[PDB]
Structures are given as C-alpha cells and as structure tokens.
Amino acid sequence: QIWQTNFTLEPRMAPRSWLAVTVDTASSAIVVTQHGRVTSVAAQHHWATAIAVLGRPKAIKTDNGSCFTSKSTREWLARWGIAHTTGIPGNSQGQAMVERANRLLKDKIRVLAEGDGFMKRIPTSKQGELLAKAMYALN
Amino acid sequence: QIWQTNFTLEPRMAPRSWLAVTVDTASSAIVVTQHGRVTSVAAQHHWATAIAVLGRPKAIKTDNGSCFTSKSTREWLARWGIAHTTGIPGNSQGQAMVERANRLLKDKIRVLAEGDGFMKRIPTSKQGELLAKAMYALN
C-alpha cells in the first residue's frame, strides 16, 4: 500500500473544517478526519485512524507542508516503519489522486448536507455522521 | 455482514471510558469508538463510524439495553435499512463474539498502555492513537 495524504479546507464542517484526506492509491479507498488546525499532530492523528481503517501502508506521499516535513512527523512515520516521500503542493505523481479525492469528498458533503436541508454550515452535532456517510458513499 | 455490538467500560480511557465495540461475525474484524455515556445517539455515532470502516451490514445483534431498544435507535437502523435483533445481556448467539472482542481489546489496551509507561489512566491526549493502534493490532 502506498497512500497519498493532504489537508483540504471545508467550511461546511467548521469549526473543525480542516479535512485530512488519505487515498489508498491502488484501491482508491479514502479515509477522512476533521481537524481544527493543520498541525503535525493532526496529521499523525489522521494517519493513526487511517491505519486502523486500511492497515499499515508501506509508504505515504505528501506535499512539503510543515506538518509533513517536521521532525515530529518524520519521527512518527519512522516509529511506524512507514516510508515517506514529499513533493511540491499539487505535484501530480504524489498528489493528483488525493486532490481528486478532495473534490469527490467536497461534492459529496455538499450533496448530503443540502439533502438534509443545510445550505451552509452543517450543524456541529450532525457533522461526524455526515462525514462518515460521505466516506462510506465514496468507498 | 452480520455484526454484534455492545458497550464495555474501560477506565484506562476515561473520561470517555465507554467503549462501543462492534465485531463483524464472519471476519472477526472489530471497530471501537470512545464515548462519555451510553446513549442511543452514542450507539448511532459508533455505527456510523463502523459503516465507514466495514461497509453497511445486513443486520446487527445487540442486547436489550435502552440505547438499542429506543425509538431513536429503531428509526436510525430503519433509515439505514439494517435489520436488528436483540437478546438479553450476554446471550451467546448474539453477544459471545463481541464479549470476546471486549476482552481482547481490554487486554491489548492494557499491554499498549503499560508499554508506554501508563500504569493507570492513559493521558487524554494519547488515548485516540492508542485505541486506534489496539484496533489495528487486533484486526
């Protein structure tokens, strides 16, 4: 398994509107979690969840954002025995599949939310299940 | 897919020490989430997560706890098209596999926690990743 991971901003999910998104490259399966801020520890929390969902990957591709190049994240990945490659934001080889997942997720979130009567932000108490439904639907 | 679901109390995970545990009967895969209280909505939040991890099941077996027999939970399951069977707490046919999962999970949580130097409660900031690690290890 080789994953692509990024963060994408989704105000429908505010306050925890920073979505950490992983796509498994061979299967196209997605894992998404919500966060208040993009940080090294948010990335690590996200991947911990993703490992529990998909298994432990051999490698993860990210961009060169601080949250991915930090000593903390380097060490977390090493502790897990997961290889890491980084490129510039949006590079195709390492980020095009996760960027597609971002777009698919945002469209799905919008459609579900609007279907439930939410034309703008999703009420806080409804976000977790809606996000899980979007993940289910896409996978 | 037929699941067995229950709640089990794990003080190492306090304050959100109520663990909602699902086992997929054919694969023995487990999904676990943390909760502060056993409620109908906690069960629903748990299953929403479980569907995102395992897929939508045909049926779920639980005990006859309030959180499972409520109008709210009946309706949530119906909305999802998931059949439900209930029995007395601990009944074998519908709860023995999830009770085994409870025991496997609690042992794993203890071993991981003690390995990290936590002889009693796990620090709050460390619980989510430790729980995800336990789920990964068991699956």
**What are the residue boundaries of the structural domains of chain A, listed by start?**
1-139
CATH code at B1-139: 3.30.420.10
| Distance between CA atoms of residues A106 and A70, nearest Å | 28
Give me the amino acid identity at A105. Answer: L
Neighbours of B106 (CB within 10 A): 18
According to DSSP, residue A57 is labeled -
Contact residues on chain A for B128, CB-CB shorter than 8 A: 45, 48-49
Contacting residues for B128 by C-beta, under 8 A, at least 6 apart: A45, A48, A49, B34
Select from A51, A128, A133 the Cβ nearest to the Cβ of B136.
Answer: A51
| Token duo for residue A79 | 């502790």
The answer, for B6 touching chain A at a CB cutoff of 8 Å, is: no
| Distance between CA atoms of residues B19 and B11, nearest Å | 10
The answer, for B42 touching chain A at a CB cutoff of 8 Å, is: no
| Distance between CA atoms of residues B42 and B53, nearest Å | 17
Strands, E assignment, chain A: 2-9, 18-24, 30-35, 59-63, 83-87
Contact residues on chain A for B35, CB-CB shorter than 8 A: none
What distance, in Å, lies between the first and last C-alpha atoms of chain A?
Answer: 16
For this entry, resolution in Å reads 1.2
SS3 letters across chain B: CEEEEEEEECHHHCCCCEEEEEEECCCCCEEEEEECCCCHHHHHHHHHHHHHHHCCCCEEEEECCHHHHCHHHHHHHHHHCCEEEEECCCCHHHHHHHHHHHHHHHHHHHHHHHHCCCCCCCCHHHHHHHHHHHHHHHC
Task: List b or e across A11-39, with b for residues whose CB sees 16 or more CB atoms inside 10 angstroms.
Answer: ebbbebbbbbbbbbbeeebbbbbbbeebb
Is the CB of B48 less than 8 angstroms away from the CB of A139?
no
The answer, for B1 touching chain A at a CB cutoff of 8 Å, is: no
Give me the amino acid identity at A107. Answer: D
What distance, in Å, lies between the first and last C-alpha atoms of chain B?
Answer: 16
Q: Identify from A24, A53, A77, A109 which residue to disrupt to test chain B contact, counting B C-beta atoms within 10 A and taking the largest count.
A: A53
- Of A100, A115, A110, nearest to A30 by C-alpha is A100
A94 near A85, Cβ under 8 Å? yes
| Distance between CA atoms of residues B4 and A65, nearest Å | 42
Contact residues on chain B for A55, CB-CB shorter than 8 A: 136, 139
